[PDB]
């Protein structure tokens, strides 16, 4: 299992409704859940990234 996050539901629905409302299971806040190196630096056009991380560049100690 992976602790996923958002998918933002398109009506917020936690307006406390006067004319018609329902409870039994679906209650929440505004964001749900869904349970179900040696790399270089700032050079040009296309190969900066190690994808999302950027390390392997300032261990000058140990």
């Amino acid at each position: 299992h992976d602790r996923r996050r958002i998918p933002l539901k398109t009506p917020l629905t936690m307006r406390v409704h006067h004319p018609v409302s329902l409870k039994s299971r679906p209650v929440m806040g505004d964001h749900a859940t869904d349970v179900n190196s040696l790399l270089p630096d700032a050079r040009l056009s296309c190969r900066p990234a190690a994808g999302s991380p950027q390390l392997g560049r300032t261990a000058v100690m140990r």
Partner: protein, 311 residues
């Protein structure tokens, strides 16, 4: 039965045992606010009854304001409705009949609502389709509202899974028709809940002030002659001490008769100890100990004792 403060997160699941364990904490807070000067299991304010059906064996309650030993306020003008009619044909006796008001005991571990026709006692009723106008300007709507499941009982049965708070007492008259006892005191919470006690206290006060005025009229303006002060006037100041230092407290308490009885006991038992040394040839402590939910053993003994000792 513990009480848990619920935690209000954001982005979680709501469950009704956050609302219930929220709501049951404030009543327990108000209980411990109330138990800091006062020290008893509280009682009845303003019981009223109907008497028309009394040629038959039928009763009808009309207005109750009752508070139980767990801080549960029962109101019938705003909160709840009237408990139903009890039937008295199951008693042939002419003797004492004591009607208590009973509430089912609060649940421990699951199942407490009066849907389900199986024979179990601890219940709280559910009323629905109650049109409630919101205080915003809009229309009304059908909500569900908690109703307590009250009833009247007989106090000679077995009351093991209920609560007991006595209300009235019936004695059959000599012609067979039922009548209500004029001398019955439920466990009080405000002195305007039983008028005959107020009648006896009003009579006590005018009994008192004339005893004061005769003694004030027995004082001339010559406070010099000690010889006429050493015999016939050597206890009159002892008596005027006691009658002057306990009147304006008692008049204060009977101006606005809206307080708990412990205040009134703590004045009558103060005056009665002071007016016991003058005629101290009788029993040394006949003053009744206020340990009671039963004031019939309490206040008519004190008023009869003061009505003697003003002599």
């Amino acid at each position: 039965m513990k009480i848990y403060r619920p935690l209000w997160e954001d982005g979680a699941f709501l469950m009704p045992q956050q609302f219930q364990q929220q709501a049951a904490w404030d009543v327990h807070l108000a209980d411990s606010v109330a138990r800091m000067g006062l020290a008893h299991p509280w009682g009845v304010v303003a019981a009223e009854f109907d008497d028309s059906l009394l040629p038959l064996s039928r009763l009808n309650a009309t207005r109750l304001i009752v508070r139980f030993p767990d801080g549960t306020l029962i109101d019938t003008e705003r909160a709840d409705n009237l408990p139903p009619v009890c039937d008295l044909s199951t008693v042939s006796d002419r003797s004492l009949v004591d009607i208590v008001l009973a509430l089912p005991l609060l649940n421990a571990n699951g199942g407490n609502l009066d849907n389900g026709s199986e024979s179990e006692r601890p219940r709280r009723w559910k009323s629905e389709r109650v049109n409630v106008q919101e205080l915003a300007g809009h229309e009304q709507s059908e909500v569900a509202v908690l109703r307590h499941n009250l009833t009247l009982r007989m106090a000679h049965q077995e009351n093991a899974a209920w609560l007991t708070c006595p209300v009235t007492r019936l004695v059959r008259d000599a012609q067979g028709q039922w009548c209500r006892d004029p001398r019955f005191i439920p466990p009080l919470l405000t002195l305007s809940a039983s008028p005959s006690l107020m009648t006896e206290l009003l009579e006590l006060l005018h009994h008192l002030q004339a005893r004061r005025q005769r003694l004030m009229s027995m004082r001339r303006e010559n406070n010099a002659r000690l010889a006429d002060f050493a015999v016939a006037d050597v206890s009159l100041f002892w008596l005027l001490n006691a009658l002057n230092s306990a009147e304006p407290v008692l008049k204060e308490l009977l101006d606005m008769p809206y307080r708990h009885p412990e205040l009134l006991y703590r004045e009558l038992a103060r005056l009665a100890g002071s007016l016991l040394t003058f005629s101290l040839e009788h029993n040394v402590d006949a003053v009744p100990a206020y340990h009671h939910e039963t004031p019939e053993n309490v206040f008519p003994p004190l008023l009869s004792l003061l009505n003697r000792l003003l002599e």
